């Protein structure tokens, strides 16, 4: 839900205000939380729902990386 | 002479280290002696005029020689030090001439007579009447005007330097942001302002634009540098050129009417001022009490009020410090002698009993100056020129001769040829005027002078 | 405790208090006695991960400053062993990064370095209010780090070892992500253009000035994002000549470069899990003596 | 533990840095320095730290984090304390320990008469100590070489009779020969203990390089008689079989002869004469020793190579042309390596062009060159190792450098002296010394910078919890050395203010005697504390100490703050004196005068807090009581 | 000030000590009789061995500039009277300025490393492209025709011209087949002709086209390239006045020639005294903020044939009079510096008819002050 809201705009309902208005749009949040989440998901891999969640998270991360690259290009075009 | 001009023009670009300071010091003595033998002690005014002319000439020469190259070497450093010492010697000579003129003017009216004491309208008449009752406030305001003239002369060609960058339009960014907000509902996502007046943000307690604040700070710096010199014409000129005449319109409330009109044919001169100077200085005292703005407005409010507690860190230089002290003490004395003798029901300046039952004199100034706990003032009160100025102002003899004896015991590690010449000329002028010193110090001065001459 | 990652961990000038600023939403300061540790202070008032920290001298006032990922500058003062509120600022273009006070030779002027496009310098005068100096149009992308520079270094002015007191004015350097390095000097009563240089086209991490206590040579070791390092040396009078020379380059992500308290050992930390501790030898060159694991 | 590959991520995960008292705060463990399993984890200082880090057991889905604070302190010093103190304690008395202007500047004194004393001390220590390491022997031989170079060469001996120039040169040559023999006798003894009566020519190959007295006994036992060995042991003129073999080796090098098999059974001539080395591209191996020990190599070179008419400079030039590659082919000799323990250099027979890359140069050659002329390059020379395998401990090196600077032979390069003084101060503060670091730092010229440095050093060392040893050290610093006491007083005042001892901090501040700080401190705390705790004696003492006219004329607000307390104390004292002496109108008049003069500044003296209000109420009631008393006393009872 | 002679044995500078030792070795070789190599190489190797780097690189540059195949003159008067050696030295100074710009580009590449916005790639053309991508990778407004791999062709050509890589310029021209107009042959001819021979009619047509159209575009690099090609005016400034006078001096030297070549006409050439006055007044000390970097001022003074001015500037600095005397004695060994009498006048003297920069050095006064500022020094020096 957090990734979906960040990709859309629904951050006010969660508490995050305006994003970091920087020149180069890149990843600024600590990746330690995402790494710990991935480790906790990979700890128990006995069912198919964990693999499905991992695949959905990978697809969402790829889409977010593409959108971030597009935003960085649009910002550098200025 | 075009030789000096071409020499300095070549030296400003050449890559050599030539110090004509020795030649200037060797050539200034015959010209000084010629001026002395041409103008004796009788025509003291013309003598000091020619002296100031020649001194400004050699000061310009030395300052051009100094500025013709970067003063990094020891030779040019000592040349700049000699130039500063020459400026100080000339300002001390100006102070000595002013004090001599004041003493000559007071010698013809040392004795006075009192018979009229009934007050009238307009406190300017009472001030003019009390001016002849005591010479302390007289020399106080004389030193004040002398410091104002010093600041005016030190400002220089700033009025012409301003024209190289004087603006004309203001509040451009604020007007653009307001237009954007009014035409597109965006462009003001911040504590915006309501009106385009200089008092609107300071009244709403919400500022805007740091660049506008910096420009206003620079304009206030310019206004302070123009007012400190004792100028108003150039101040209102810059105000009309830029657009910030509110400061000049506000700095016109502590005046007083000039009640002298007796008919209709006489011009109307009793239109400047207001009788509410009491409440004006009371509001200024409250402002100095709750001061939380910039240093320049804090200092101007301190000078307009007279709170020593906040004036102690406000005083930037020794001249400003002594000016503020003199103004505070003369204002306290005048207001006390006016109120306690007529009416005292509303204290215009919040002065407690410890300040109301205390007659300030002249030695207290030097007392607090020596008691200054600041390290800068403590070091400045122990050099040479500062103590010379203090002794010249105080007209002492015991401490002066004691310090001269200590200087002679130390040796020639502070005085120079020009210093000894100036001291000999000052001693000769004092002996021609009145009183004298001691035979021992006199013959010591003479032998040191002739030794420097033969050297 | 500190279960999460730990950023910076500084110690008091005497060796009693230990201020460790981490992202665990807790700043714990213990004690140093008999080789043990006892919790004595628990401060917490930030909104994000706390980053850098800087101490001060007790002769000028026990004041601490902490920066976090929230565009907020937090300042505490020590009284009777308890730290309370002092100055709390909030609101910037980006989060604050670097924070440090000027050396004891100048005063207690704090420097705020962040990728905001401008420079906001805080000056502590008197015993109450402070002053703010704003410098705009100085960084296209923004600042990164600010390293102070004392005036007691004989390498900058050749007049110190001659019974002459040098000037005590503010001087430092800056190397933001605007592909330009710059020097700042408090001249003409404010701040303006002093000396700029172009030696990169990306990001620059941090810098380190040499606080030499007896070495008449002023050096600055930089560190960028792509393992780039520049050693600017100076040993002239009045005006210095910064030489953009190179030493031991890298290809990873070099982060911090820190000089010793007396300009003796350089510590470089990046992505190699090795902190090369360099040192000036007696032959006027560099030599590494000890290492450590990360 | 995180170890997967990443793409792009800003921020950071672990930060290291430095800290005061010369400390390092770093992430991770210390595997690059320590290897044993006995390693202190989560340490905040050296020797036992233990920081609470419960995240060690919580892993798998979490990465551990640990930070260690340490201080650089390598090796271990146990009995080396006296061995490092004796030369330092001798140099402290040898050099000047007086002030020079405002900042204490120490001047170096030329002391060439201490080299022989240091050598004798090293010899005595090695005699009465069986645990002598190789570093002590290296220091002893270097001191002996320095004494033979610049030290006393036994001049002006036997009444007023001095040798000539040639006699002095011969004495220097024989002293260098004795030094080489003393340095090579260890290796000769080891070789003798290894082998003796066994091989023939294979042993003579090294016996010729040896040949002394203890080895000459075995030489005679292996040959036949001892009369020939006793004559061959002596040098300078005495040459029989030595000269006979030299006559053959002279022609051997002149001819074009090479080697066959076993280069230690038929090449017996290769040891003595040795013409200038000249090689083409074949297999040549002659000159001295032929790949042995450089000490005995140079010994034989000085003994039986060049004639005694040659000088040390000529011998050095010949050895350079020997082991240099500029001879015309490929060298095959050995280079004198700097001896830190037992030949601790880099390779043998290398020209300076191939040595300047990283190979350390000799120390004896550098000393001889410095004795010759100081016009040679010294910026890249002078190895930092002080005859030790570790670069630490700059004792004899600093001694020699100070001696050279006092004798005026170095060059204008203050950076080297600065870094050496900094390293020495670091080592001394690590081992636990203060005055020694102080007096080795006071040598350089530095006003305010070094003043603040020594101020910080005194504040960090001397505190309020000092021991009798620290008190004796401070007394010695004040007496036998030159050091202002105001800096120590200010440091003690700062330490007391950082603690809380009110009386101690007040005494230290009053001893330092400042202006604004002292005035505000006294007027804010001292009068109130004295009134509360009845500290009348301390109050009167402080008032008498501060009632000087200079302080009152320099500081402000004093005549309005402390003058009230001064007048009150004087009034109380005079009232007590009057009550003790019954009637005293002459004192009662001044009492009433001062009382009615003080009865006016009640408007100036105000409050500030609850303690201020209490003090004001006390002062008001006391003033009222004294006013009633003087009003009752003013009326005549007649 | 300088390294004066200390009374007896004391402490001197390592640079002066090494120089005195090398002079002693030179005198020993002279007494021996064998032909000596050159003291310049010995001084260069001594500066490289010493820890000093700035003065070492300065002396390396001086040696590489003096190692040009020029005839050794006798005095400064003869050097300034001869005309062929003057233009030869000017051409050599232009070539060395191009080489110095190439070395600065190489240093910038080494500082930028490889993995930093397309780092430096081996090869001259690749290095120029990497420098262009580091400086300005974005397309500059004012583009004509196409581009080479999305890079500004005009900026690439300007960088190649400033670096002096004629082979890289030829490679760029060969790569820009359809990405440019019909001036590829003119570019190739201008690169292949050292004397700049690309038809006078074509040169006049290009000059007319530049004066007509190319006079207000938003591409400063393209404007400067077209101006250099068409040979118009004497100085064309766009955006180089920003503490980087090297490009401006290079453009001025490329647009101004003493001898009349192809497309040579009035209002297209200047004189050496003009540049001397421009560098002495407008670009002098305490004028263009050049006192913080005296090395660049000394370099441009030595390049613009102002030996006396460079010597005076090096003497005016602190702790540099020793190096000034050293380069003076080096020039004396190389047979330069015109002798002049006088013991009380200044060091920089001139006669009516002499331009600024090239003055008559008072060797007598120099020796007098050198002997007066000395004490009973060591016998070696």
UniProtKB/Swiss-Prot annotation, chain E:
GO terms for cellular component: cytosol; nuclear membrane; nuclear periphery; nuclear pore. This is Nuclear pore complex protein Nup93. The keyword Protein transport applies. GO terms for molecular function: structural constituent of nuclear pore. Belongs to the nucleoporin interacting component (NIC) family. It comes from the Eukaryota. GO terms for biological process: nuclear pore complex assembly; poly(A)+ mRNA export from nucleus; protein import into nucleus. Plays a role in the nuclear pore complex (NPC) assembly and/or maintenance. Its main location: nucleus. It is found in: Nucleus membrane; Nucleus, Nuclear pore complex. The keyword Coiled coil does not apply. Keywords: Membrane, mRNA transport, Nuclear pore complex, Nucleus, Protein transport, Translocation, Transport. The chain holds residues 167 to 547 of 820 of the full protein.
């Amino acid at each position: 839900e957090y990734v979906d809201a960040l990709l859309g705009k629904g951050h006010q309902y969660f508490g995050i205000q305006a994003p970091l208005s920087a020149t180069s749009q890149l990843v600024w949040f600590p990746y330690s939380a995402i790494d710990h989440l991935r480790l906790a998901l990979g700890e128990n891999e006995n069912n198919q729902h964990n693999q499905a969640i991992l695949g959905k998270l990978q697809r969402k991360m790829d889409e977010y990386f593409q959108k971030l690259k597009k935003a960085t290009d649009d910002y550098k075009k200025i | 002479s075009p030789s000096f001009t071409e020499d300095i023009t070549l030296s400003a670009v050449m890559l050599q280290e030539e110090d004509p300071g020795e030649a200037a010091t060797m050539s200034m003595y015959p010209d000084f002696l010629k001026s002395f033998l041409e103008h004796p002690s009788s025509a003291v005014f013309e003598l000091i005029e020619q002296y100031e002319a020649t001194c400004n000439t050699q000061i310009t020469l030395l300052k051009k020689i100094v500025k013709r190259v970067t003063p990094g070497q020891q030779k040019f450093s000592k040349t700049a030090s000699i130039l500063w010492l020459l400026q100080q010697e000339m300002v001390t000579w100006r102070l000595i001439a002013a004090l001599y003129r004041d003493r000559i003017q007071s010698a013809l009216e040392e004795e006075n007579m009192f018979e009229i004491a009934a007050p009238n309208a307009s406190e300017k008449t009472i001030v003019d009447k009390l001016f002849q009752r005591d010479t302390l406030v007289r020399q106080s305001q004389l030193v004040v005007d002398w410091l104002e003239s010093i600041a005016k002369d030190e400002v220089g060609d700033f009025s012409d330097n301003i024209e190289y960058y004087a603006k004309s339009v203001y509040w451009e960014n604020t007007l653009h942001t307001l237009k954007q907000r009014s035409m597109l509902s965006l462009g003001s996502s911040r504590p915006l302002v309501s009106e385009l007046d200089p008092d609107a943000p300071i009244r709403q307690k919400l500022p805007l634009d740091d660049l506008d604040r910096e420009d206003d700070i620079r304009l206030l710096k310019y206004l302070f540098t123009l007012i400190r010199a004792g100028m108003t014409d150039e101040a209102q000129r810059l105000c009309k050129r830029c657009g910030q005449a509110w400061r000049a319109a506000t700095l016109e409330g502590w005046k007083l009417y000039h009640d002298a009109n007796i008919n209709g044919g006489t011009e109307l001169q009793a239109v400047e001022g207001n009788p509410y100077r009491c409440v004006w200085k009371t509001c200024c005292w409250r402002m100095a009490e709750d001061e939380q703005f910039n240093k320049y407005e804090r200092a101007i409010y301190a000078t307009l009020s007279g709170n020593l507690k906040q004036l102690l860190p406000v005083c930037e230089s020794w001249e400003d410090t002594v000016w503020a002290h003199f103004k505070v003490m003369v204002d306290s004395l005048v207001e006390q002698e006016i109120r306690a003798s007529i009416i005292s029901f509303n204290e215009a300046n919040e002065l407690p009993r410890e300040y109301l039952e205390a007659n300030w004199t002249l030695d207290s100034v030097f007392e607090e100056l020596q008691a200054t706990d600041k390290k800068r003032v403590l070091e400045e009160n122990r050099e040479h020129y500062h103590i010379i100025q203090k002794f010249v102002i105080l007209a002492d003899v015991d401490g002066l001769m004691d310090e001269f004896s200590e200087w002679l015991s130390n040796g020639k590690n502070l005085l120079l040829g020009h210093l000894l010449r100036f001291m000999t000329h000052l001693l000769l002028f004092f002996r021609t005027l009145g009183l004298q010193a001691k035979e021992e110090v006199s013959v010591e001065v003479l032998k040191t002078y002739i030794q420097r001459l033969i050297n | 405790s500190h279960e999460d990652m730990i950023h910076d961990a500084q110690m008091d000038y005497y060796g009693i208090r230990l201020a460790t600023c981490s992202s665990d939403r807790s700043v714990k300061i213990f004690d140093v006695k008999n080789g043990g540790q006892i919790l004595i202070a628990d401060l917490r008032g930030h909104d994000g991960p706390v980053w850098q920290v800087a101490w001060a001298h007790p002769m000028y006032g026990n004041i601490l400053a902490s920066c976090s990922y929230d565009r907020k500058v937090i300042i505490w003062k020590e009284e009777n062993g308890t730290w309370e509120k002092t100055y709390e600022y909030t609101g910037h273009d980006s989060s604050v990064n670097s924070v440090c006070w000027a050396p004891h030779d100048f005063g207690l002027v704090l420097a705020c370095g962040s990728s905001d496009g401008a420079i906001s310098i805080l000056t502590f005068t008197g015993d109450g209010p402070w002053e703010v100096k704003k410098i705009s149009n100085a960084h296209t992308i923004g600042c990164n780090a600010v390293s102070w520079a004392p005036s007691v270094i004989p390498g900058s002015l050749v007049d110190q070892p001659s019974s002459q007191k040098p000037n005590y004015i503010k001087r430092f350097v800056s190397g933001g992500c605007d592909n330009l390095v710059k020097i700042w000097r408090e001249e003409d009563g404010q701040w303006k253009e002093d000396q700029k240089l172009e030696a990169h086209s990306d990001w620059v991490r941090d810098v380190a000035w040499a606080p030499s206590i007896g070495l008449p040579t002023s050096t600055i070791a930089s560190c960028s994002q792509d393992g780039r390092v520049y050693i600017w040396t100076s040993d002239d009078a009045a005006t210095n000549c910064w030489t953009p020379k190179l030493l031991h380059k890298f290809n990873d992500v070099v982060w911090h470069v820190s000089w010793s308290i007396t300009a003796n050992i350089l510590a470089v930390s990046g992505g190699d899990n090795k902190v090369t501790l360099w040192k000036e030898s007696v032959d006027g060159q560099w030599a590494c003596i000890s290492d450590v694991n990360k | 533990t995180l170890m997967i590959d990443m793409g792009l991520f800003m921020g950071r995960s672990f930060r290291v840095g430095w800290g005061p008292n010369w400390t390092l705060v770093h992430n991770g463990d210390k595997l690059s320095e320590r290897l044993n399993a006995e390693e202190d984890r989560d340490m905040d200082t050296i020797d036992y730290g233990f920081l609470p880090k419960p995240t060690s057991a919580k892993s798998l889905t979490e990465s551990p984090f640990k930070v260690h604070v340490e201080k650089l302190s390598l090796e271990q010093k146990t009995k080396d304390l006296q061995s490092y103190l004796l030369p330092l304690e001798i140099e402290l008395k040898n050099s000047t320990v007086d002030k020079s202007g405002p900042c204490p500047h120490f001047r170096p004194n030329p002391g060439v008469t201490a080299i022989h004393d240091y050598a004798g001390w090293v010899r005595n220590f090695s005699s009465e100590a069986a645990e002598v390491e190789a570093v002590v022997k290296q220091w002893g031989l270097t001191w002996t070489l320095c004494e033979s170079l610049w030290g006393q060469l036994k001049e002006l001996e036997a009444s007023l009779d001095e040798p000539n120039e040639y006699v002095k040169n011969l004495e220097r040559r024989k002293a260098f020969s004795h030094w080489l023999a003393q340095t090579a006798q260890e290796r000769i003894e080891e070789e003798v203990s290894l082998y003796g009566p066994e091989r023939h020519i294979e042993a003579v190959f090294s016996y010729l390089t040896g040949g002394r007295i203890s080895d000459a006994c075995r030489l005679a036992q292996k040959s036949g008689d001892h009369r020939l060995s006793l004559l061959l042991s002596q040098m300078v003129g005495s040459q029989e079989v030595r000269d006979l073999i030299t006559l053959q080796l002279v022609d051997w090098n002149k001819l074009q002869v090479d080697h066959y098999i076993q280069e230690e059974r038929l090449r017996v001539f290769c040891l003595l004469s040795g013409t200038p080395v000249w090689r083409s591209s074949d297999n040549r191996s002659i000159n001295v020793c032929s790949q042995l020990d450089w000490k005995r190599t140079l010994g034989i070179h000085l003994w039986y190579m060049l004639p005694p008419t040659a000088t040390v400079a000529q011998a050095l030039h010949m050895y350079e042309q020997a082991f240099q590659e500029q001879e015309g082919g490929e060298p095959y000799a050995c280079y004198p390596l700097p001896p830190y323990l037992e030949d601790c250099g880099f390779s043998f027979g290398d020209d300076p062009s191939a040595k300047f890359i990283s190979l350390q140069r000799d120390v004896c050659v550098h000393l001889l060159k410095l004795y010759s002329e100081r016009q040679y390059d010294l910026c890249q020379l002078l190895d930092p190792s002080s005859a030790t395998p570790d670069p630490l401990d700059y004792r004899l090196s600093w001694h020699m450098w100070m001696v050279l600077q006092a004798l005026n032979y170095t060059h204008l390069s203050g950076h080297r002296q600065g870094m050496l003084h900094a390293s020495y101060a670091a080592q001394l503060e690590n081992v636990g010394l203060w005055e020694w670091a102080i007096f080795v730092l006071l040598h350089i010229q530095d006003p305010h910078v070094r003043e603040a440095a020594v101020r910080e050093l005194l504040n960090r060392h001397c505190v309020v919890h000092d021991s009798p040893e620290s008190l004796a050290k401070e007394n010695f610093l004040i007496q036998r050395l030159c050091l202002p006491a105001q800096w120590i007083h200010k440091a003690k005042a700062v330490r007391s203010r950082r603690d809380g001892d009110k009386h101690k901090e007040a005494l230290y501040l009053l001893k330092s005697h400042q202006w604004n700080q002292c005035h505000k401190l006294v007027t804010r705390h001292l009068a109130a504390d004295a009134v509360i705790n009845e500290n009348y004696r301390y109050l009167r003492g402080f008032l008498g100490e501060l009632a000087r006219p200079e302080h009152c004329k320099h500081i402000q607000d004093w005549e309005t703050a402390g003058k009230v307390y001064l007048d009150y104390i004087s009034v109380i004292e005079m009232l007590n004196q009057i009550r003790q002496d019954e009637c005293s109108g002459g004192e009662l008049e001044k009492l009433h005068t001062k009382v009615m003069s003080l009865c006016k500044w009640v408007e100036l003296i105000q409050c500030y807090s609850a303690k201020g209000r209490l003090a004001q109420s006390e002062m008001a009631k006391r003033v009222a009581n004294i006013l009633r008393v003087v009003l009752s006393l003013q009326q005549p009872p007649e | 000030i300088s390294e004066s002679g200390a009374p007896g044995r004391s402490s001197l500078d390592n640079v002066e000590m090494a120089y005195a030792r090398q002079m002693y070795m030179y005198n020993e070789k002279v007494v021996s009789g064998h032909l000596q190599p050159s003291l310049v190489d010995l001084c260069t190797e001594a500066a490289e061995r010493l820890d000093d780097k700035n003065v070492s690189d300065l002396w390396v540059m001086v040696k590489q500039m003096t190692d040009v195949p020029l005839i050794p003159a006798s005095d400064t008067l003869k050097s300034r009277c001869s005309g062929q050696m003057q233009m030869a030295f000017v051409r050599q100074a232009l070539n060395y300025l191009e080489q110095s710009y190439k070395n600065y580009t190489l240093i910038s590449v080494f500082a930028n490393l490889q993995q930093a916005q397309l780092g430096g790639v081996p090869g001259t053309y690749n290095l120029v492209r990497s420098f262009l991508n580091i400086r300005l990778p974005t397309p500059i407004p004012g583009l004509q025709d196409g581009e080479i791999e999305g890079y500004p062709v005009w900026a690439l050509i300007y960088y190649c011209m400033r670096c002096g890589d004629l082979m890289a310029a030829q490679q760029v021209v060969n790569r820009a087949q359809h990405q440019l107009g019909d001036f590829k042959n003119c570019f190739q001819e201008y690169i292949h002709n050292k004397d700049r021979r690309l038809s006078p009619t074509t040169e006049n047509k290009l000059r007319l086209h530049y004066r007509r159209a190319v006079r207000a575009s938003t591409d400063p690099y393209k404007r400067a390239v077209y101006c250099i090609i068409g040979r118009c005016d004497v100085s064309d400034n766009h955006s180089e006045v920003a503490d980087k006078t090297e490009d401006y001096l290079w453009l001025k030297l490329s647009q101004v020639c003493f001898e009349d070549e192809a497309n040579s006409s009035p209002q297209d050439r200047l004189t050496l005294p003009q540049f001397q006055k421009q560098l002495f007044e407008d670009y002098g000390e305490s004028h263009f903020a050049v006192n913080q970097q005296p090395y660049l001022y000394f370099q441009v003074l030595f390049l613009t044939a102002q030996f006396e001015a460079a010597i005076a500037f090096l003497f005016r600095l602190e702790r540099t009079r020793c190096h000034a005397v050293h380069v003076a004695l080096a020039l004396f060994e190389l047979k330069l510096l015109l002798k002049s009498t006088g013991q009380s006048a200044q060091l920089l003297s001139q006669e009516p008819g002499e331009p600024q920069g090239v003055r008559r050095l008072n060797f007598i006064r120099l020796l007098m002050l050198y002997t007066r500022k000395f004490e009973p020094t060591d016998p070696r020096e």
